[PDB]
Symmetry: D2
Subunit: 75 residues, 4 copies
């Protein structure tokens, strides 16, 4: 009965050890997940801004070709 | 005049392209917002569930220790 | 003994301490959920205003090019 | 008035380059800020959990001190 009680205590103190080990492991895992997901969205948006900037310059180059073209319809 | 026609058609293609690029960015705002909170909540809830589990085990440890104490107090009481 | 009184003391105090510690973890988690939303929204809204400003300047730039072309169509109208 | 139109084009293209640059520099700033915020809250919770764990450790110690004492009486008697 007392030794049963001691058994209960020994089980519980192992449960506790396991529970705090799991908490520390999961913090690392979550941190890596969060970093990945944040970086994904940020790199995605950075890529999207790059594509927009490229398109703006493409528009500007194209206006220059058209202006050249009118500078030849004129000639 | 082929050059005028070509550049105009090119311009129209790029104007359409740039409109969709902007919309893809703005469209994604509520979806990224929803996902951010869903991910935050998944972690928060798991972490609270774990803390509560530790809390219960500590409580069980404490009741158990006190049961053992209720065995020594009664043997000391027999003893006397 | 006087000592058993004092270990029962530490016990009651350790138990009170652990209770406060758990409560503090739970209160912080709920406060931090709000900080997440508030912080996210501030940045989100800033990025929305900036993209819109870029979209508006690009529109002005395109409209301006239309203006120049207009000038050339009329000189050619000749 | 085309020359001025050209001035206007140049001014607006400059504004757009400056705006794109600002979006990029702000995203970089935000990324580090976000991580520092995340890391502070992660480390704070880990520290709180460490403190709880040590409080448990101590509970166990003084319980053993209580037991040990009851064991001296059971002996005495």
């Amino acid at each position: 009965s007392v030794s049963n009680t001691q058994n209960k205590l020994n089980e519980l103190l192992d449960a506790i050890r396991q529970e705090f080990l799991q908490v520390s492991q999961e913090a690392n895992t979550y941190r890596l997940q969060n970093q990945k997901d944040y970086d994904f969205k940020m790199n995605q948006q950075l890529a999207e801004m790059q594509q927009i900037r490229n398109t703006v310059y493409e528009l500007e180059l194209t206006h220059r070709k058209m202006k050249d073209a009118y500078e030849e319809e004129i000639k």
